[PDB]
Amino acid sequence: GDVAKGKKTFVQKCAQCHTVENGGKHKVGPNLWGLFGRKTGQAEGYSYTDANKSKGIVWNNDTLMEYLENPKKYIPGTKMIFAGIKKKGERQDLVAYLKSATS
Ligand code: COH
């Protein structure tokens, strides 16, 4: 995807609740450094719902694309209150940015 477009999407729709840099702070939601290839609910020092800790899947392109379309459908009980990025292209560019900015 397009990293520069995904970045703007992240700043507009995600930054209020998340940081991406290494050592970044937890805001409403968890810092996302190291997200890819890791199981759900594993950011150090963040208090996740039991649902986000137990989903049990590994975050990658496939699972993040599904999740970001409708967070609560994928993780029922989640405290991330956000409707989702409905357009596939916008979601793909956002995943491209996340992959680039979290490692
Ligand atoms: C109003 C707050 C808010 C918004 C707008 C938002 C917008 C977005 C966003 C924008 C499209 C992106 C890319 C993300 C991405 C994520 N968020 Co949020 N998140 C938010 C609050 C949270 C919270 C809170 C959690 C933890 C949920 C839980 O523990 O159930 C979270 C969890 C997540 C996770 C799972 C982390 C993990 O399993 O370690 C990802 C990925 N996210 N979030």
From Swiss-Prot:
Modifications the protein undergoes after translation, according to the UniProt entry: Binds 1 heme c group covalently per subunit.
Pfam families: Cytochrom_C
Molecular functions (GO terms): electron transfer activity; heme binding; metal ion binding
InterPro entries: Cyt_c-like_dom, Cyt_c-like_dom_sf, Cyt_c_1A/1B
Keyword annotations of the record: Acetylation, Electron transport, Heme, Iron, Metal-binding, Mitochondrion, Respiratory chain, Transport
Subcellular location: Mitochondrion intermembrane space
Origin superkingdom: Eukaryota
Residues the record lists as N-acetylglycine modifications: G1
Chief location bin: mitochondrion
Binding site for heme c: C14, C17, H18, M80
GO CC terms in record: mitochondrial intermembrane space
Summary of the function given for this chain in its UniProt record: Electron carrier protein. The oxidized form of the cytochrome c heme group can accept an electron from the heme group of the cytochrome c1 subunit of cytochrome reductase. Cytochrome c then transfers this electron to the cytochrome oxidase complex, the final protein carrier in the mitochondrial electron-transport chain.
Similarity comment: family membership: Belongs to the cytochrome c family.
PANTHER family in UniProt: CYTOCHROME C
Protein's UniProt name: Cytochrome c
Native species: Thunnus alalunga (Albacore)
